[PDB]
Amino acid sequence: AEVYNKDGNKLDLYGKVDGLHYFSDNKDVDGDQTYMRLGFKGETQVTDQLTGYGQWEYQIQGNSAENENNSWTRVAFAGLKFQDVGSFDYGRNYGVVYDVTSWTDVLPEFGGDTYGSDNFMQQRGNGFATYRNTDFFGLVDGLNFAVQYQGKNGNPSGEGFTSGVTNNGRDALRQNGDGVGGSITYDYEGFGIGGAISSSKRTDAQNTAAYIGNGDRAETYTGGLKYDANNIYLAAQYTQTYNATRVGSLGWANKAQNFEAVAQYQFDFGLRPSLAYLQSKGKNLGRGYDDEDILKYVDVGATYYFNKNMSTYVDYKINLLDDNQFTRDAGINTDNIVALGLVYQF
């Protein structure tokens, strides 16, 4: 909702409450999953060509008792945009690989989980410096590219570490050395085609015997396709990764091949059914694991839109992973899940 628009400054205050419940034989995901998100997007006109902006988004879980608080910052960044040249922003933001993979992250509840948060340059993460050029100086409609740098996020401070520390340090599964990446997308009418590449130094804390997938750098290569017209949405992405994909709590995959596909239709009366397939196939994993499925599921669901502010959905994760030693060791969910959600948003 735009709550302020005066003398060239605009402020949009937005959010949602998702009354949400999971049904699953897996009791670690089963039960109340209610949550809310809040955010703001602000923009200020500096000149006719130059605009400054900032965005912040926060998630607060609504499913805990009052003696605890489970909340986090999704994004927080400030930036400058110049008409027909580009933009730059810095902060917690999305990695440029997400420019392509976001195209299949459109499912009612699940999806978008061949990668995670704080996972090199694949999704949300800290310390992104992002440069973007839209429409190639305004001379090629629909063509966009981006180049991104990520600074090191290392070991926690004040915990007796003698190397690799940063002020905002964290556990090794969520660390990263310096990284660089890029994306190109082209959209003509309904069609879209895109590609992205990322390369991040891996830290010493990540390259210990306690984690599978030791390596100097984490690399990702992504291609994507999209069709979005005539009430039909189709998209697919394929990603090859090296020492970049987490294998639950075990560490990372030496190599992984990720694939996601989605098909959706929008009825006039407000119903939007969705069908999707995701898989992540790991190779040469180490410790005798050899080749294993990290993720494999079919997602069938539907959303009903009452209007732009109220909707309800059901999403059914038909989980094709089988319960074995590998998935047990990594703590990967192999059970089906049904989600039922009712969402108010502004």
Binding site: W56, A76, F77, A78
Partner: protein, 396 residues
Amino acid sequence: QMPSLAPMLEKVMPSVVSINVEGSTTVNTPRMPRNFQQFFGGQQQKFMALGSGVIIDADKGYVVTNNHVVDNATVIKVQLSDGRKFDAKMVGKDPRSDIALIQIQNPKNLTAIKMADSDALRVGDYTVAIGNPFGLGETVTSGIVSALGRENFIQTDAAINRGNSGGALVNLNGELIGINTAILAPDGGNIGIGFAIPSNMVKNLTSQMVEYGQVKRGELGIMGTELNSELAKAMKVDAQRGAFVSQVLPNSSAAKAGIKAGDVITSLNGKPISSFAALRAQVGTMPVGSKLTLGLLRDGKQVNVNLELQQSSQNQVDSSSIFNEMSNKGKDQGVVVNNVKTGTPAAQIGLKKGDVIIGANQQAVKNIAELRKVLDSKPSVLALNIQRGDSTIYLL
């Protein structure tokens, strides 16, 4: 033995002082959290400044210094080169020239520099600068006169890489030839070489602060810029070769007499005006009450008018030895007070937005020098014979 600048420096240093300013200002309230990958876009905040100054009147304890150091000061301290410490109070300042005057409170045995005649300077002439570059103390650096402007800003290579625009510029005889300044405003720090106000101008601007309270510089009260600005384009200006009027200042002579944003001044008293620059500098060669007729451009508009004291150089809590933004009004026609604030310590005393003060708590106050001359002699009973046009009240 060997040549050295130490012998004259020993006769000069006692006149150079160090200055420590403490003061506050209004900063915007930080919005959290902080996202360094998100390029965005009231509370007083204390800050500390430090600079150099030169003793210019040993008896009165008058020290000349840069306005970028003492600006916004609440507390200004001075330390002599022998280590004696004193307190100081604002007596004057002038942001254009970046020159300010202060007075050591309770001077005792001071030494003043002799001022040389700026007009006799020549380019190959030797120069020596004295200042406090990085805070670590009083540094002297040497060199020569690089460019003699010809406003006559002096240019010299006796500067300092990445340091703050020090203070005194002295010749080989130990005489003051210029006060080094900072042309990188609201910053301090140089462009690569040094810029000094010439000693003769320093003498002149400085006496005004003493004998009037401020410098007699009239403003045309317009504000604007060049014909390249986004507004000169976003508003498409015909015939571009002059000063763009972005706005006419309120209660101004430009405002009073007639003028409106858009018109591009083309001349000033017959002479061509090709840039705000040219104009800003020309209006600076004219003391208050002067009359200057200039040609504007809308279709072909032109007028004649008389300007009043500028608003940049003003006073604050130093007129009444007590504590609390006036300035002079026209000729010796009292002291007119300007924009009052929010804390309202002085407004609370019955002083509005346009209140003159011809009554020296009993006598004549044709100016702030005089007025302040009384609020310093008889600090007992004070009744300000103020008359803001009509109302002639007498507050305490």
